[PDB]
Amino acid sequence: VHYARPIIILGPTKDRANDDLLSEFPDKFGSCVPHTTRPKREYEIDGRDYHFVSSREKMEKDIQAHKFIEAGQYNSHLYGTSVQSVREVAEQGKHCILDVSANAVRRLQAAHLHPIAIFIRPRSLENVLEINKRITEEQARKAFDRATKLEQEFTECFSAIVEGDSFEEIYHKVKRVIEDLSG
């Protein structure tokens, strides 16, 4: 089996693009599961909702030993996506579709996992409204501002920058981008 590079899509509509790749090509795209020290709720399922960690000290040590591409605290419990969880998907020859922040890109590269980082760049506020038709003007201005700051601060880590007048255009480009950079 050949290693498949993990994927981090960023920018407006990245979550729709993530869901679409998984639902269209389940043979080439997969997901991994985050870790948490929060205790498991009865209905939750270990290895499915989270990898539930019983020792907060254990997770703290692993975070400091760089075992996570992303980690943080909420409601006094730890949360993170582990290097190994990405590696397992990649080793099985599937692109791991990651829903992580841009700071994870550098951590994935430093962990030698060779990510594909794709930035969907809005051309303007109006372009945001073209490609996401379910949001208010305010939400679109917030998305546009976030994308401007994202590009200003993280443009050096992008594998590809994609643009378009509709989500369909962006999605076709995203798929074509992944095929070009994987071969």
């Binding site: 948490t36 992303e70 980690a71 943080g72 949360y79």
Partner: peptide, 14 residues
């Protein structure tokens, strides 16, 4: 497949 707990932990207000 959003995990709201996870997103709050990893996207803290700065």
């Amino acid at each position: 497949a959003r995990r709201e707990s996870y997103l709050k932990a990893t996207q803290p207000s700065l």
